[PDB]
Amino acid sequence: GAHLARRYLGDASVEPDPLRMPTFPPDYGFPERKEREMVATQQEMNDAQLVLQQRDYCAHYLIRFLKCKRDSFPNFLACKHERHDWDYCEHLDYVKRMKEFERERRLLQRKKRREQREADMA
Amino acid sequence: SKMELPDYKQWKIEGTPLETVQEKLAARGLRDPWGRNEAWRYMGGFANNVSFVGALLKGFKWGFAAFVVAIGAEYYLESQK
Amino acid sequence: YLTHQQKVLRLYKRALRHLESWCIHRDKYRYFACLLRARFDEHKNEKDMVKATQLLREAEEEFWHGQHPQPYIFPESPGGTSYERYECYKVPEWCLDDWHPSEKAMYPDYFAKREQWKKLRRESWEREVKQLQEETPVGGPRTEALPPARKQGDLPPLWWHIVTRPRERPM
Amino acid sequence: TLCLGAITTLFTAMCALTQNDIKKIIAFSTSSQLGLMMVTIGINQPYLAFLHICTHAFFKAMLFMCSGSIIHSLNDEQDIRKMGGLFKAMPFTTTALIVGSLALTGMPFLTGFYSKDLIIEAANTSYTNAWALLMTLIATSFTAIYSTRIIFFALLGQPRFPTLVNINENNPLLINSIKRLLIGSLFAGYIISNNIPPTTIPQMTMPYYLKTTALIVTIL
Amino acid sequence: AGGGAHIEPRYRQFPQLTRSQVIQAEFFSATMWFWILWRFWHDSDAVLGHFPYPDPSQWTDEELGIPPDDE
Amino acid sequence: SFPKYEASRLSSLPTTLDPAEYDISSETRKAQAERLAIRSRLKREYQLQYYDPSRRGVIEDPALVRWTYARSANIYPNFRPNTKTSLLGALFGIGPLVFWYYVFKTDRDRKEKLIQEGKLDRTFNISY
Amino acid sequence: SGYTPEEKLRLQQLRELRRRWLKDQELSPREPVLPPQRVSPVERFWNKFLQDGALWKNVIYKTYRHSIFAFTHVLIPVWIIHYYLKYHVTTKPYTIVEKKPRIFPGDTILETGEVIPPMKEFPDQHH
Amino acid sequence: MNMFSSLSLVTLLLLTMPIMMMSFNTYKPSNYPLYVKTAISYAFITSMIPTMMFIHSGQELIISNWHWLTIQTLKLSLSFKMDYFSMMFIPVALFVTWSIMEFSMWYMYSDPNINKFFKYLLLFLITMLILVTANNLFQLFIGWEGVGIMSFLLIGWWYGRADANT
Amino acid sequence: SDAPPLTLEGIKDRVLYVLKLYDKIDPEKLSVNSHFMKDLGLDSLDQVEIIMAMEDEFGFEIPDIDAEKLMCPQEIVDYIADKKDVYE
Amino acid sequence: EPYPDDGTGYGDYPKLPDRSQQERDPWYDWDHPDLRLNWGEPMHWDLDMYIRNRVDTSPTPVNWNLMCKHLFGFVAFMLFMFWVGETYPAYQPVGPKQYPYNNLYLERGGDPNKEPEPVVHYEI
Ligand SMILES: C[C@H](CCC(=O)O)[C@H]1CC[C@H]2[C@@H]3[C@H](O)C[C@@H]4C[C@H](O)CC[C@]4(C)[C@H]3C[C@H](O)[C@]12C
Numbered sequence A: 001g002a003h004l005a006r007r008y009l010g011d012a013s014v015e016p017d018p019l020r021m022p023t024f025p026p027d028y029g030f031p032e033r034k035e036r037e038m039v040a041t042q043q044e045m046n047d048a049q050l051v052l053q054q055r056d057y058c059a060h061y062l063i064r065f066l067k068c069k070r071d072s073f074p075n076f077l078a079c080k081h082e083r084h085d086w087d088y089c090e091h092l093d094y095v096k097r098m099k100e101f102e103r104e105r106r107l108l109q110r111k112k113r114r115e116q117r118e119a120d121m122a
Numbered sequence B: 001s002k003m004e005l006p007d008y009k010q011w012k013i014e015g016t017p018l019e020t021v022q023e024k025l026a027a028r029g030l031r032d033p034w035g036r037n038e039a040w041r042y043m044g045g046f047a048n049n050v051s052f053v054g055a056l057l058k059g060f061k062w063g064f065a066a067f068v069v070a071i072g073a074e075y076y077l078e079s080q081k
Numbered sequence C: 001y002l003t004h005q006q007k008v009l010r011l012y013k014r015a016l017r018h019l020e021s022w023c024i025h026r027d028k029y030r031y032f033a034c035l036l037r038a039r040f041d042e043h044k045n046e047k048d049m050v051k052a053t054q055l056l057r058e059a060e061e062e063f064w065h066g067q068h069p070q071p072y073i074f075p076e077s078p079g080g081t082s083y084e085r086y087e088c089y090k091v092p093e094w095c096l097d098d099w100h101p102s103e104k105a106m107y108p109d110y111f112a113k114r115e116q117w118k119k120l121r122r123e124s125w126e127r128e129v130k131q132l133q134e135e136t137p138v139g140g141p142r143t144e145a146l147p148p149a150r151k152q153g154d155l156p157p158l159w160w161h162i163v164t165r166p167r168e169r170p171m
Numbered sequence D: 001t002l003c004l005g006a007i008t009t010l011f012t013a014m015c016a017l018t019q020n021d022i023k024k025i026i027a028f029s030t031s032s033q034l035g036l037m038m039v040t041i042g043i044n045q046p047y048l049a050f051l052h053i054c055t056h057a058f059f060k061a062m063l064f065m066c067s068g069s070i071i072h073s074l075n076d077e078q079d080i081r082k083m084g085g086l087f088k089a090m091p092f093t094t095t096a097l098i099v100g101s102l103a104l105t106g107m108p109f110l111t112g113f114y115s116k117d118l119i120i121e122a123a124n125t126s127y128t129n130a131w132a133l134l135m136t137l138i139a140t141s142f143t144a145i146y147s148t149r150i151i152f153f154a155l156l157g158q159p160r161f162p163t164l165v166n167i168n169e170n171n172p173l174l175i176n177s178i179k180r181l182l183i184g185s186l187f188a189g190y191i192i193s194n195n196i197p198p199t200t201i202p203q204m205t206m207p208y209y210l211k212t213t214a215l216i217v218t219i220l
Numbered sequence E: 001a002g003g004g005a006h007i008e009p010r011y012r013q014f015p016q017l018t019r020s021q022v023i024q025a026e027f028f029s030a031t032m033w034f035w036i037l038w039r040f041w042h043d044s045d046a047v048l049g050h051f052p053y054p055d056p057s058q059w060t061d062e063e064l065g066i067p068p069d070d071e
Numbered sequence F: 001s002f003p004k005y006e007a008s009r010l011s012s013l014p015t016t017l018d019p020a021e022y023d024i025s026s027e028t029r030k031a032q033a034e035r036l037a038i039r040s041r042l043k044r045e046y047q048l049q050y051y052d053p054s055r056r057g058v059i060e061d062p063a064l065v066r067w068t069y070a071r072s073a074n075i076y077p078n079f080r081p082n083t084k085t086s087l088l089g090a091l092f093g094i095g096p097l098v099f100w101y102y103v104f105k106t107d108r109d110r111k112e113k114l115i116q117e118g119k120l121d122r123t124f125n126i127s128y
Numbered sequence G: 001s002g003y004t005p006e007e008k009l010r011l012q013q014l015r016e017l018r019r020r021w022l023k024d025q026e027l028s029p030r031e032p033v034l035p036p037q038r039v040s041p042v043e044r045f046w047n048k049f050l051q052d053g054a055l056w057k058n059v060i061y062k063t064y065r066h067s068i069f070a071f072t073h074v075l076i077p078v079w080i081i082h083y084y085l086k087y088h089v090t091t092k093p094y095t096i097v098e099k100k101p102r103i104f105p106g107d108t109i110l111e112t113g114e115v116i117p118p119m120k121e122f123p124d125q126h127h
Numbered sequence H: 001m002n003m004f005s006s007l008s009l010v011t012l013l014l015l016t017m018p019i020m021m022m023s024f025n026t027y028k029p030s031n032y033p034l035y036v037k038t039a040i041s042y043a044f045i046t047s048m049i050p051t052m053m054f055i056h057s058g059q060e061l062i063i064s065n066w067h068w069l070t071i072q073t074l075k076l077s078l079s080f081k082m083d084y085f086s087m088m089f090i091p092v093a094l095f096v097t098w099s100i101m102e103f104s105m106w107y108m109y110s111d112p113n114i115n116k117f118f119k120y121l122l123l124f125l126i127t128m129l130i131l132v133t134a135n136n137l138f139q140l141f142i143g144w145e146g147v148g149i150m151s152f153l154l155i156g157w158w159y160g161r162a163d164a165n166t
Numbered sequence I: 001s002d003a004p005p006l007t008l009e010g011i012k013d014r015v016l017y018v019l020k021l022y023d024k025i026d027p028e029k030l031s032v033n034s035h036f037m038k039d040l041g042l043d044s045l046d047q048v049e050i051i052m053a054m055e056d057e058f059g060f061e062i063p064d065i066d067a068e069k070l071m072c073p074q075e076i077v078d079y080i081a082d083k084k085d086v087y088e
Numbered sequence J: 001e002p003y004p005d006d007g008t009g010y011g012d013y014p015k016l017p018d019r020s021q022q023e024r025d026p027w028y029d030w031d032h033p034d035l036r037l038n039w040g041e042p043m044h045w046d047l048d049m050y051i052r053n054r055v056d057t058s059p060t061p062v063n064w065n066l067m068c069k070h071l072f073g074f075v076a077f078m079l080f081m082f083w084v085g086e087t088y089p090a091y092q093p094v095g096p097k098q099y100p101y102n103n104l105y106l107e108r109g110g111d112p113n114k115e116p117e118p119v120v121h122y123e124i
């Protein structure tokens, strides 16, 4: 990585802490913030027997891919389209985690400037 | 069954890497007295062995020949459906 | 006890073998093999038993500092990955005397041709014993070397196990 | 588990850079591979560790049989310093030996790639010990170094074996035995990876310098 | 060992070869390159990259809900 | 100029680097003469019976008998209770027993205290 | 350094004895004298039947030996195992436990005909 | 299910028959090395049938056939866990061993005790399959120590060599 | 193990054949019984290289206690035949 | 050379050099080839510890002291670096991953009766 140098060879209070994020209110800065929706219900995931690390918002694409694989047998090269859809859906979920990370980094630095401004005058 | 050992007069240190060893020993007044005994390792079917880069590339000539057609065959087939 | 010539020759053989391991490539070994020979030829005539000795001791100390950590070994030489490998197939000859008669019957020619050696061995034993006890000094032998047979029809003393020793690839 | 595996892959691979016996070199390769598997358990990727076991069996087993063919030809000689010039003297053994050494090093789309390169990529993108990750990356480099040592000292150069050797590999048992692993060593990784049902969330997006690191370090 | 064609060893010479031995060895070696190339053209993302890695240093402050400095 | 070889009990001094292999006097040369004289006499007795074709059995080796006898039966009659034997006997005979007693007694006293208090997790502990 | 005058004689005397000993170790053509042995009638048939190459008829022996192997090493054991499992193991509780089959939205249950409702409409996107 | 479980156990039982026949039931030393190899070949084929079923529907099951010992509240049974890990490693191990044995017939052709060598190799394969298919720790320990002891007997195969015993 | 056996004629030919590739021995002055020292005038260092040249030919080491006692090609053949159970 | 008369029970058994049997000449013709012994030779007090299957005292290419310093240094260095790399882990710029239905409270064995503490994640 590269951001480590900004936390190890640099100030640590200006960097996010993955063991402590989020460190700011979720609604702070988001008027009437929207909530992520789960298309797949609990029963569908329970009856689909998905690993807990897959029981996530990106589910309801894995179920469709798994359903295709059971049906395309023995054609194991098929269902490729559903794989990409689930790969893409997970990818969007990964980028949003980075957005939460960059949002955390900016807010921390925003608190830095605000505190210094009122601190210096005092 | 008796085995026919080749004639020993065909093993020579000329034109092989053993010659350049003779040149460097010559400059110091020394000579290689076993050079012809180790000469067979550089002549015959062992001469001009392939390189490391060429060795890893073995069979690539035919492989790429079959690769281009394979995708080309798919290209026409996929055009229809 | 080893003479100076014996020790010098051994150091020359080891150095080439370690040098051979260092170079791997034959032509490179050939280049350095001769240079090593040259360093030895320039002290052959030295007749000074003291200055010559210093050379050997300094020669050995140089060999140790440059000896290959993992010298090449011939597979069946002590240390090579075949030493003692076939010792598990070498059966002593006397085991055949314990075979069941129904098992000797499978090789009538071998065992018929085997009684001769046993017949030969017993007959020669008395002469072999007598030869040793008359050529042995009063205080007993001073070395392990053994005399040959000094007549015709007499086998060398103490030949049975040397002659009859198991083969090298018995099975 | 991460630190224990990381030192094992680095240390054993390091010991294989200067070995002469062909069987010893593969042994230190196996220890290096096992260290990589332990690292995979230490990054919480149990199924990738298993997938590496299945894939690793094909070419690591083949590399020993191919080396066994060389040893038999030279009359029970195992030190690579008395080998060479076998690229065309034993063409079939060379093909399998070269093919195997490319799965061990992790050439893309061969059997080794679908477990090895998929682990190093998953190692870089995880909350993990930094030194353990570095030692794994260095070890992957050493995999190519000693893999090339066998090829260079057993296929290239000029022969160093004695004058009389019975270099023959025209035995159907030997050829067929190597042939099947050669087929598996090429296709086994692709077949398994596309049939095993998913059990985790794989990591597919990562920085350009962490997606080719396994391949980039191998080439160096 | 036992089985296969009996080939007489050649003293101080390159060993004899057969046709099937040379041909088959070449067939599998060529199979590797054909397999690598065919997959490298259909699964090129597997060896280079699957999805773009967005740069965090370009996102706007309103999509991330970053208030201005003053408030 | 090289680093002189350093020899430990598990790394013997090489014979080549040993100064005793070069300074050969008349005594040293004669000393090996008598060593090979006795070594030759023993090698003679063994071969007289080893090669004898009328012998079936085991050639008793007095050297082997003396080796085993000293290792087992001649130890106590040559034992004297002194400072060395007494201190080593207690350190290697009684020390480990006292050490392990406090390791185990301390551990069980600790554990027994927790169980009485109820602070030791024994939810599914029904096999003992 | 070379051999003393007597040493060359001893080695020659032994080297002649040693090379004679190694010749005695050879076996006569008749040896080993195998006691009379009887084979089964089946074995005698293939001894002379297979002498001719006849690649078309040689595969018969290959299929014959493999056909026997599959019957005595695959079919009989699976008969014993299946009989053992079906009527002795599966008649006891929890001896064989299966991970229940996965039910996906849109499947039809073969025990009751129930149809699990499909999943809601996705925010479909082509990527 | 019946086919899945029956074909899973036959793979193990098939590998035992060459060992059983060493008690002079059917005698054929000339082809015994070939006999062991052919058994591995058929063991791979049968093991693939459960493997293909797992690929299709993700089917896995436990087989606790034999009740061995019951120490109060600990019931120990000979249990085989046919699941993701066993269904995938058994075909691979048998496929590799198949090639190893065929290679062995050539490499070890001149070994006097080739019959013993092939019995030992098969004994290791059985122990590993016990290790791989174990469902409880005690059965896993049988295979755990089994592979170790078979390693000892095969590492020191040439027992006249002081450096192989070490 | 599949290796052709070594015979007295085969051993001797290879022994002489090795020396004929030695630049310091005349092929016409070389015989099965040609002493290496008293006839070819080779120094002991060359004699050691002759033994080394034979070890690489037959691929087995020879003790230095016994390498010194071999001075003519006849004795080299006898040693190898005795050391590899060769009788015909 | 008899052992020191310190009362440890050696008596008059000869004290021989503490040299392993692996050192003895491998080419000499021994009465017992595997033990490197001659019939009648006085056996070392610790012969069974110095057999070729056990402790070996042969000279080593590298001095004993330099071997221990290098091996200890390597192990000591590696352990420190792992500790150094433990407090300074390398991770990726991403926040904690999000799971639905209150971070999978029901899936992870949560108590059905006691309603969990609500956990909400927002689109971003
Ligand atoms: C099938 C296999 C290979 C035959 C071939 O194709 O050449 C042959 C080789 C040795 C044979 C086996 C051995 O001969 C031992 C048994 C002898 C009888 O043939 C009955 C079954 C028996 C167990 C054989 C089964 C099978 O026919 C074998 C295994």
Ligand SMILES: *C(=O)CCCCCCCCCCCCC
Pocket (backbone or CB within 6 Å): A001, A002, D124, D209, D210, D213, J090, J091, J092
């Ligand atoms: C960060 O999270 C992983 C630690 C860095 C490992 C990869 C090191 C190589 C990238 C730096 C070189 C960039 C130029 C190619």
